[PDB]
């Protein structure tokens, strides 16, 4: 599994550019910020709900512990 006999690809052309002739931070904020926003928008609906559920359970359990540790009028 070394370069030269990995696969068989045809009719593809790739153009590149020397790292010494192109900027290393091309529009790091002009397109960085919108790209980040799209990335988080397309994943928050799947990532957040479990952790938000955990936060609700954490706070409920902690306050349940706190007000179960009090004294019962008797």
């Amino acid at each position: 599994r070394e370069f030269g006999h990995l696969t068989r690809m045809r009719h593809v052309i790739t153009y590149s550019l020397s790292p010494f002739e192109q900027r290393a931070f091309p529009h790091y904020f002009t397109k960085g910020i919108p790209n980040v926003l799209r990335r988080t928008r397309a994943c928050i609906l799947r990532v957040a709900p479990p952790f938000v559920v955990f936060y609700l359970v954490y706070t409920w359990g902690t306050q349940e512990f706190e007000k179960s540790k009090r004294k019962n009028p008797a």
Partner: peptide, 20 residues
């Protein structure tokens, strides 16, 4: 097969640059 390979390579490029 050629179209399959090119589509896959373009997709890998896009995911490398984290774009669509």
């Amino acid at each position: 097969y050629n179209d399959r390979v090119f589509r896959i390579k373009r997709a890998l490029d896009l995911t490398m640059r984290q774009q669509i």
